[PDB]
Design a protein around this ligand. Structure first.
Ligand SMILES: *[C@@H]1O[C@H](CO)[C@@H](O[C@@H]2O[C@H](CO)[C@@H](O[C@@H]3O[C@H](CO)[C@@H](O)[C@H](O[C@H]4O[C@H](CO)[C@@H](O)[C@H](O)[C@@H]4O)[C@@H]3O)[C@H](O)[C@H]2NC(C)=O)[C@H](O)[C@H]1NC(C)=O
Ligand SMILES: *[C@@H]1O[C@H](CO)[C@@H](O[C@@H]2O[C@H](CO)[C@@H](O[C@@H]3O[C@H](CO)[C@@H](O)[C@H](O[C@H]4O[C@H](CO)[C@@H](O)[C@H](O)[C@@H]4O)[C@@H]3O)[C@H](O)[C@H]2NC(C)=O)[C@H](O)[C@H]1NC(C)=O
Ligand SMILES: *[C@@H]1O[C@H](CO)[C@@H](O[C@@H]2O[C@H](CO)[C@@H](O)[C@H](O)[C@H]2NC(C)=O)[C@H](O)[C@H]1NC(C)=O
Ligand SMILES: *[C@@H]1O[C@H](CO)[C@@H](O[C@@H]2O[C@H](CO)[C@@H](O)[C@H](O)[C@H]2NC(C)=O)[C@H](O)[C@H]1NC(C)=O
Lengths: 686, 686
């Protein structure tokens, strides 16, 4: 049988040449008129927009043809479908480097390609029999539910409380069948916990494969019961030759959508994208012989583990299942990863520099292409943000051991005291730490404050590790020609914004040449020694927000909602970006991967952009931010209530509150310490 | 073909009943006299010692029979081997729940079971043809190299420098053969980098399977060249029916032993334990068609990624390959995990309490059995310490979100201000944080200091969150009957040590009922408010060492070695356990999973136990410790030089320096802050 090492032509697909894809126009072939119109429409829309797609058929590494779900009843005959396949313009003789895509939307009994010879082409679909599944070569994909429609998070029930009305539920109609039915009916009768198990359909059943449990009713009927259940049961078909069915995949989709943790009875099943995804992290898979132990097992699991499973299922669904675009990207990424080609680089925000009248070292980029696609496979596919983009830098890059900088990897390192260590002097003379030398860029948002901007920019004169200052001009009116900008020793670049928005401060501007960004308001007052210590801390904590202003979130018992609080406190949960360090990676994520609703809300209130970034970074890392110094001030009411509303809405969007509390801040080691006369403090006041 | 869902009897193996194993005595059967004596000897030794093994054949979930590598030439005939198998006492009719183990030591051409019917039994061996490999049911295991011998880490070359003399090496003797040979010879001729590739054996080749590259010379000859090479090339057999061979596994073993990163040409191969292990993290697997791109790919990889690969290979080798005991444990663990049964609990240090003459809440235990074996599969098998033990607690347990304690999971939580937050008062009245309420236990080592012990114990009177005090009596002489122990409000338990050793303070005593341990010398002076703040920080940082005394390690340029330093410094790398918090988990690891050489050295110098624990915790987490307060003192020369030697030896044992620098310490949020009169500081002096 065909495998990737004896039916794929690698000569078309060099490692460095990218991943050019050619998509056939199905309207120019007999398939087009018989396709289900919504599938055709959505697929054409997503293929038109995809970055990998090319019109140049001669350079293509992969060819894509949509044969799709066809209208019922299927007019086309298998032999004539085969005849059309073998007649495609670039189906040279055997169809190597072709993937045939057949997306399921409405029918769970259609098996077009069962009697069709596909030569050397790969097949991506949701239904497979053992005689036509080739592991590692074929792809199991999710069904296309939301075609020409959007899934709204507002209708997804919240992740908490962990326990819902029913422990588990099942609805279906149709050797272990009798055993399973008796065991689950006994569980229902005993009433140790509330369950709702039905083995007949009240609403007329949907047509099904011969030995499969049929879906009951409409999609809206099922979600109503699934929204009330902690777990969702998925019983696999009794036929041993059936690897995966569209019905079981639909059940899995509907369970993951509303947060019911799937419980699969039967290990022979191949779940969608199972080659890349660790489904054990999001679903429980149990052998049918162990059905008598399912109730005990489900009762044994802890709340936090169950909640982690629910969260991982939400991630998987949103990233790979929810839209046609996601399905197409997942197919392309699976094929690209199998043949070890890196993802396409993520786009930067090109900007126009406003001309004005008045040594930087840039961090290296794109050093881990192959490592990220092949070596870090698990993190790439099972952790946010996902595998679809290649970033120039990443805060999770492995660091070298302490010895390497002395034994052959010292390029760029600046040890303290040459490796002997030392006191304040040796500390102030070198960055030290566990990573090479580095600079940072200041990003400043300004609006109708033309004079304070000059003063604040002048205050930045002489910062030791400053690469450049980026001034984001938000006002509709351009700066005047008579405005003399100060000479602070580093370039000042004024970038023109296409529209007025607080989200512009987190745009990944092309002008930013450093991993580190210092985000500062145009009227903030920071001493040089605070900035430098914060930079060192961030160098030690690259994946956190490291900043000066602190806030925390509080629970309102009478209303069972969250409140934003800014009193002085002994514990914190947010560090405002009015003065904070963070990695540019998060700017890309904020601008292009974070949900659109959050940015739209930021625009609506012209407020809460810092809260959104804290939400994002806590969601990614599951760690709180770092408070750097003792200061709390750095110098309306509706502006204050808007933030309570922002917090509540963001909780709705994410499904949970990602913020976490910290009960400590950081200071320099020898801060306020009584030293011997030979020693010197690291900082005079910090 | 047999699969686990149609040839395994789960009725013998309930989830809660453990994993009882019965091992046949091979001496009582015709196999025994023909076995290779060293394989037989080592296997019997390890089976005798294993915790899962039982002599009660009626309760056994699994049955193990060693047919092993046989003496060459093989006298026994396949039919007679089959005859003996089907005659085993508990081979009922078909051999269900049997695993046949055939370990390879000396021969790479022996294929005993090729013409043998095994019924429903599983087979664990190193050589498989496609007609006799059943994925998910059979096991690919490593060869038994170190039989009745020990692998010494002293002969393993250091992980750094990353680049060695040769970029890659190959030695072997014997469609892509000509392509590969020409490409690699061209790489050698071009001399962009130094390589040594030989396609004939200078020393007589070892016998090999028909289409396999034969091993050259003796094992000692190969390691000499492998020690000098950054990468090691592994070319798979040309026969498409050969899944895995003992020779390729031997090559992989030898590469992983000395830190040469394997480069495998051919993706059809099944590497050992590949169902559980992510080999992509430790090896590069490349299709043969891409041989022309191998040189570019190997040159592209960065030093840190290559070093991470080397470290992961070291972990995998030491955990699963190195000894016969490890191989047997891996086989048992793979089978146990496939059928979803938890690992056996790790042993505690039972102790005798010395009687003496003068509310605790215990943390819950064993709450994540199924989650750890099935849900956290990847972390369990691909991260240290490994999957072989079940721990009562773990510092990496997931934490709940902020909302859960208010919406149905509030059991044990003590929010600050009821969720509204607050100032010093509300802070001092509740623990707060992100995890439920908790206590800590004090562990105190004493020796010939009978009086200071009384005073120090008296100082502990009134600690708010103290569960009990454990006094580890090291002196050969017992405490006198006239010694009146103080009444400090909590139990004092004096535990008798079986021998005098500093390693006794990290023994996981049965008396310790808490996750947190406060390790304090019997003469240290700590104020109550320092201890409490440290406890809160640790509650926030459960996987770190959190403590007061700080030290750092320095590089000695003239000798290219490490030095221990205790001057005042602006950066730190160690927190001494003379006053520090840590998780009991690390006590289990120190006592039972850490290498024996380290503990033997601690005994030899009667010094350096704190340095060892810092090494361990940094190795596990790859994060530095946390320094809690500003104080540096809490009140011989050879004792000081011994520690330089300890550091160097530990670096030899681990293969690298795991310590990392930190340039900051932690303090309370409102420490030294000017508050409004309504607010109050969290601590008066901290
Ligand atoms: C410093 O701390 C104090 C004490 O925590 C804090 O005072 C609190 O402020 C909040 C917010 O203004 C108050 O809670 C509100 O009370 C009003 C009625 O007075 C309600 O209408 C509010 O409910 C709305 O908002 C909710 C979302 O937050 C919705 O779910 C709800 O449906 C309503 O739309 C809300 O309950 C609270 O009563 C006071 N408490 C006291 C003791 O004064 C103060 O704001 C903090 N100061 C700073 C600068 O942070
Ligand atoms: C405070 O800091 C100072 C300055 O760093 C520090 O003084 C240094 O102490 C070290 C250790 O005593 C000295 O280094 C040694 O020097 C002797 C010769 O004087 C050598 O024999 C030593 O080499 C042996 O040890 C090595 C392993 O460490 C082996 O690899 C080697 O083969 C030898 O066996 C070692 O080089 C160093 O010279 C001084 N430096 C100065 C400027 O004095 C002091 O110890 C620190 N104080 C405290 C309390 O930590
Ligand atoms: C890693 O991938 C990046 C992104 O594709 C590569 O950067 C491109 O390199 C080509 C060839 O030099 C240039 O023409 C492009 O302009 C680069 N793109 C960007 C965004 O800079 C990079 O060469 C790759 N590095 C490797 C393979 O080592
Ligand atoms: C998780 O595993 C532990 C360890 O095997 C179980 O603890 C044992 O439980 C049995 C039955 O109650 C006792 O007889 C043993 O003494 C316990 N061992 C120890 C070391 O305490 C625990 O019951 C399991 N929890 C589950 C399955 O929920």
């Amino acid at each position: 049988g065909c495998r990737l090492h004896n039916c794929f032509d690698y000569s078309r697909c060099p490692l460095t040449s990218g991943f050019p894809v050619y998509v056939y126009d199905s309207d120019q072939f007999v398939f087009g008129s018989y396709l289900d119109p919504l599938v055709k429409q959505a697929f054409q829309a997503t293929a038109r927009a995809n970055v990998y797609v090319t019109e140049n058929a001669d350079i293509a590494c992969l060819y894509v043809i949509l044969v799709g779900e066809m209208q019922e009843p299927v007019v086309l005959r298998p032999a004539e479908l085969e005849k059309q396949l073998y007649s495609l313009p670039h189906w040279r003789t055997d169809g190597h480097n072709h993937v045939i895509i057949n997306l399921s939307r409405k029918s769970d009994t259609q098996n077009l390609l069962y009697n069709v010879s596909t030569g050397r082409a790969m097949v991506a679909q949701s239904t497979f029999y053992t005689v036509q599944y080739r592991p590692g070569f074929d792809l199991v994909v999710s069904p296309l539910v939301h075609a020409m429609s959007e899934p709204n998070f507002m209708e997804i029930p919240p992740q908490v409380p962990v326990k819902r009305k029913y422990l588990f539920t099942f609805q279906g109609e149709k050797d272990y069948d009798d055993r399973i039915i008796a065991t689950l009916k006994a569980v229902q009768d005993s009433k140790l916990d509330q369950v709702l198990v039905e083995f007949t359909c009240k609403n007329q059943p949907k047509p099904s494969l011969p030995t499969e449990w049929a879906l009951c009713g409409e999609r809206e009927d099922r979600l109503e019961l699934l929204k009330l259940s902690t777990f969702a049961l998925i019983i696999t078909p009794g036929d041993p030759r059936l690897v995966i069915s569209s019905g079981c995949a639909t059940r899995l989709f509907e369970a993951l959508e509303v947060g019911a943790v799937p419980v699969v009875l039967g290990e022979q099943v191949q779940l969608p994208y199972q080659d890349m995804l660790q489904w054990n992290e999001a679903a429980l898979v149990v052998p049918k012989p162990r059905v008598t132990e399912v109730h005990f097992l489900l009762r044994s699991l802890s709340d936090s583990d169950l909640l982690a499973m629910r969260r991982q299922g939400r991630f998987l669904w949103e990233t790979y299942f929810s839209t046609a675009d996601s399905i197409f990207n997942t197919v392309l990424a699976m094929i690209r990863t199998r043949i070890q080609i890196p993802a396409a680089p993520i786009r930067e925000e090109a900007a126009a520099e406003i001309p004005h009248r008045s040594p930087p070292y840039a961090s290296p980029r794109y050093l881990r292409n192959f490592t990220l696609t092949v070596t870090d496979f698990y993190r790439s596919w099972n952790c946010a943000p996902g595998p679809f983009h290649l970033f120039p830098h990443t805060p999770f890059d492995p660091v070298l051991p302490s010895e390497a900088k002395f034994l052959g990897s010292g390029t760029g390192f600046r040890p303290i005291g040459g490796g002997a260590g030392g006191s304040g002097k040796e500390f102030q003379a070198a960055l030290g730490g566990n990573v090479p030398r580095e600079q940072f860029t200041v990003v400043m948002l300004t609006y109708e404050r033309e004079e304070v901007l000059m003063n604040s920019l002048e205050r930045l004169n002489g910062l030791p590790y400053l690469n450049k200052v980026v001034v984001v001009w938000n006002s509709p009116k351009l700066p005047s020609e008579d405005l003399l900008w100060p000479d602070i020793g580093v370039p000042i670049m004024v970038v023109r914004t296409e529209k007025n928005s607080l989200n512009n401060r987190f745009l990944p501007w092309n002008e930013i040449e450093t991993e580190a960004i210092l985000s500062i308001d145009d009227d903030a007052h920071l001493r040089h020694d605070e900035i430098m210590f914060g930079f060192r801390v961030w160098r030690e904590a690259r994946d956190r927000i490291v900043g000066f202003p602190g806030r925390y979130h509080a629970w309102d018992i009478p209303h069972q909602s969250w409140l934003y609080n800014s009193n002085y406190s002994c514990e914190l949960s947010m560090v405002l970006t009015g003065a904070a360090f963070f990695h540019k990676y998060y700017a890309y994520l904020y601008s292009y991967v974070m949900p659109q609703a959050i940015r739209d809300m930021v625009d609506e209130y012209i407020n809460c952009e810092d809260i959104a970034m804290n939400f994002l970074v806590s969601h990614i890392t599951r760690k709180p931010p770092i408070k750097v110094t003792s200061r709390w001030t750095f110098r309306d009411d509706s502006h204050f209530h808007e933030r309570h509303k922002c917090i509540n809405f963001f909780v709705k969007v994410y499904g949970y509150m990602p913020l976490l509390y910290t009960q400590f801040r950081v200071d320099s080691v020898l801060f306020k310490t009584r030293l011997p006369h030979d020693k010197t403090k690291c900082f005079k006041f910090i």
